[PDB]
Amino acid sequence: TASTALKYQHSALRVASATLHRQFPDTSVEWAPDGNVQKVVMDTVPTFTDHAMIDEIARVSGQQATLFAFDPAQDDFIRTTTSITKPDGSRAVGTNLGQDSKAFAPIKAGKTYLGKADILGTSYYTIYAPVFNTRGDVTGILFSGVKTATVQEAAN
């Protein structure tokens, strides 16, 4: 169900944030008293040639995951590594979040978006968490999500 899938996204973000910190030890993850992720700090979200980390996060969480980098010249976020694939089988690296995404305005305000969102034409249940640097600027996004059709096929 919708509420069940959205509630699960908190667990997927814990998987993504802890794995990110192990791959990049110079990052920082602040955890809330209840064990959920509070804040992710990464000064520079890099470009990726190897995508084993994001596929590990996808396999462990059982859904999809993405790390965005903020491009100030575009005023948009670029998928630098992701488990999401295009219809031709290629990795959806290099695509943008888009200013029309429901996660765009919350992320820009430094807020975490939890709810439905469209990703390259497909509807998902998502969580989008902003990635900060040590100066407080929003430098990226840490995302996890599952296709609504996948949630629905299990209910069907």
PDB file of N, CA, C and O in Angstrom, residues 1 6 9-10 28 58 64 75 77 89 114 127 130 139 142:
ATOM      1  N   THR A   1       0.824  -1.204   0.000  1.00  0.00           N
ATOM      2  CA  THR A   1       0.000   0.000   0.000  1.00  0.00           C
ATOM      3  C   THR A   1       0.861   1.257   0.000  1.00  0.00           C
ATOM      4  O   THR A   1       2.075   1.189   0.198  1.00  0.00           O
ATOM      5  N   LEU A   6       5.647   4.214   1.795  1.00  0.00           N
ATOM      6  CA  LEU A   6       6.259   5.470   2.218  1.00  0.00           C
ATOM      7  C   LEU A   6       6.918   5.332   3.585  1.00  0.00           C
ATOM      8  O   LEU A   6       8.010   5.868   3.809  1.00  0.00           O
ATOM      9  N   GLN A   9      10.372   3.902   3.377  1.00  0.00           N
ATOM     10  CA  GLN A   9      11.451   4.698   2.798  1.00  0.00           C
ATOM     11  C   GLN A   9      12.420   5.209   3.859  1.00  0.00           C
ATOM     12  O   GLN A   9      13.588   5.474   3.551  1.00  0.00           O
ATOM     13  N   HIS A  10      11.960   5.361   5.103  1.00  0.00           N
ATOM     14  CA  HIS A  10      12.871   5.734   6.180  1.00  0.00           C
ATOM     15  C   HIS A  10      13.942   4.669   6.382  1.00  0.00           C
ATOM     16  O   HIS A  10      15.111   4.991   6.627  1.00  0.00           O
ATOM     17  N   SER A  28      29.628  12.711   6.632  1.00  0.00           N
ATOM     18  CA  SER A  28      29.090  12.706   7.984  1.00  0.00           C
ATOM     19  C   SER A  28      27.595  12.446   7.919  1.00  0.00           C
ATOM     20  O   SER A  28      26.888  13.068   7.120  1.00  0.00           O
ATOM     21  N   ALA A  58      20.757  -0.638  -3.705  1.00  0.00           N
ATOM     22  CA  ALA A  58      19.508  -1.093  -4.304  1.00  0.00           C
ATOM     23  C   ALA A  58      19.201  -2.534  -3.913  1.00  0.00           C
ATOM     24  O   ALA A  58      18.063  -2.864  -3.560  1.00  0.00           O
ATOM     25  N   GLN A  64      15.089   1.023  -5.401  1.00  0.00           N
ATOM     26  CA  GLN A  64      15.979   1.857  -6.198  1.00  0.00           C
ATOM     27  C   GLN A  64      16.608   2.950  -5.341  1.00  0.00           C
ATOM     28  O   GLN A  64      16.064   3.351  -4.309  1.00  0.00           O
ATOM     29  N   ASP A  75      20.891  25.191 -11.923  1.00  0.00           N
ATOM     30  CA  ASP A  75      19.912  25.225 -10.838  1.00  0.00           C
ATOM     31  C   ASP A  75      19.077  23.947 -10.848  1.00  0.00           C
ATOM     32  O   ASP A  75      17.845  23.969 -10.827  1.00  0.00           O
ATOM     33  N   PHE A  77      19.590  19.258 -10.248  1.00  0.00           N
ATOM     34  CA  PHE A  77      20.345  18.165  -9.651  1.00  0.00           C
ATOM     35  C   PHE A  77      20.542  17.065 -10.683  1.00  0.00           C
ATOM     36  O   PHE A  77      19.595  16.687 -11.380  1.00  0.00           O
ATOM     37  N   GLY A  89      18.170  -0.178 -21.379  1.00  0.00           N
ATOM     38  CA  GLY A  89      19.049  -0.906 -20.489  1.00  0.00           C
ATOM     39  C   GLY A  89      20.171  -0.093 -19.880  1.00  0.00           C
ATOM     40  O   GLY A  89      20.809  -0.566 -18.930  1.00  0.00           O
ATOM     41  N   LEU A 114       9.028  13.321   1.252  1.00  0.00           N
ATOM     42  CA  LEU A 114       8.528  11.958   1.376  1.00  0.00           C
ATOM     43  C   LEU A 114       7.148  11.906   0.739  1.00  0.00           C
ATOM     44  O   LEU A 114       6.222  12.575   1.208  1.00  0.00           O
ATOM     45  N   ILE A 127      11.618   8.843  -1.094  1.00  0.00           N
ATOM     46  CA  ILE A 127      12.158   9.780  -0.118  1.00  0.00           C
ATOM     47  C   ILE A 127      13.363  10.464  -0.756  1.00  0.00           C
ATOM     48  O   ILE A 127      14.225   9.799  -1.341  1.00  0.00           O
ATOM     49  N   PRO A 130      18.118  15.925   1.412  1.00  0.00           N
ATOM     50  CA  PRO A 130      19.147  16.852   0.928  1.00  0.00           C
ATOM     51  C   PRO A 130      20.517  16.504   1.485  1.00  0.00           C
ATOM     52  O   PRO A 130      20.652  16.043   2.620  1.00  0.00           O
ATOM     53  N   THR A 139      24.255  20.597  -1.554  1.00  0.00           N
ATOM     54  CA  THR A 139      25.169  20.185  -2.609  1.00  0.00           C
ATOM     55  C   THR A 139      24.722  18.930  -3.343  1.00  0.00           C
ATOM     56  O   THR A 139      25.380  18.532  -4.310  1.00  0.00           O
ATOM     57  N   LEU A 142      20.244  12.539  -1.645  1.00  0.00           N
ATOM     58  CA  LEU A 142      20.281  11.093  -1.464  1.00  0.00           C
ATOM     59  C   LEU A 142      18.852  10.573  -1.554  1.00  0.00           C
ATOM     60  O   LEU A 142      17.997  10.961  -0.750  1.00  0.00           O
TER      61      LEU A 142
END
